Design an enzyme around this catalytic site. Structure first.
Site, PDB file in Angstrom:
ATOM      1  N   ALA A  34     100.665  23.322 -33.774  1.00  0.00           N
ATOM      2  CA  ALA A  34      99.583  23.664 -32.848  1.00  0.00           C
ATOM      3  C   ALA A  34      99.495  25.145 -32.466  1.00  0.00           C
ATOM      4  O   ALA A  34     100.296  25.974 -32.896  1.00  0.00           O
ATOM      5  CB  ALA A  34      99.749  22.847 -31.567  1.00  0.00           C
ATOM      6  N   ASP A  35      98.503  25.449 -31.616  1.00  0.00           N
ATOM      7  CA  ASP A  35      98.377  26.727 -30.935  1.00  0.00           C
ATOM      8  C   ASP A  35      98.949  26.561 -29.515  1.00  0.00           C
ATOM      9  O   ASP A  35      98.565  25.613 -28.827  1.00  0.00           O
ATOM     10  CB  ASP A  35      96.900  27.131 -30.880  1.00  0.00           C
ATOM     11  CG  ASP A  35      96.663  28.455 -30.169  1.00  0.00           C
ATOM     12  OD1 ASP A  35      97.170  29.477 -30.682  1.00  0.00           O
ATOM     13  OD2 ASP A  35      95.982  28.418 -29.123  1.00  0.00           O
TER      14      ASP A  35
END
Length: 77
Positions: A34-35
């Site tokens: 993810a970010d």
């Protein structure tokens, strides 16, 4: 945790977004790495909009879409 309004707009944003219709483990677009700041700032957002704190049972391992959602659901305001 009123839930739905801020659960919506739609993840605002669609920033923490259920693009999937797949079960909570799959995340904003997240569940292999993810970010970071997206998740962080939006669980900041959710923190405040839903105005609570979260043990890991009502978490049910929040990957921060349908599980925090179902949490906030289970929580309610």
């Amino acid at each position: 945790s009123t839930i739905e309004e801020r659960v919506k707009k739609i993840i605002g944003e669609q920033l923490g977004v259920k693009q999937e219709e797949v079960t909570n483990n799959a995340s904003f677009v997240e569940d292999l790495g993810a970010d970071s700041l997206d998740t962080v700032e939006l669980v900041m957002a959710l923190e405040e909009e839903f105005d609570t704190e979260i043990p890991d049972e009502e978490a049910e391992k929040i990957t921060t879409v349908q599980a925090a959602i179902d949490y906030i659901n289970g929580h309610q305001a």
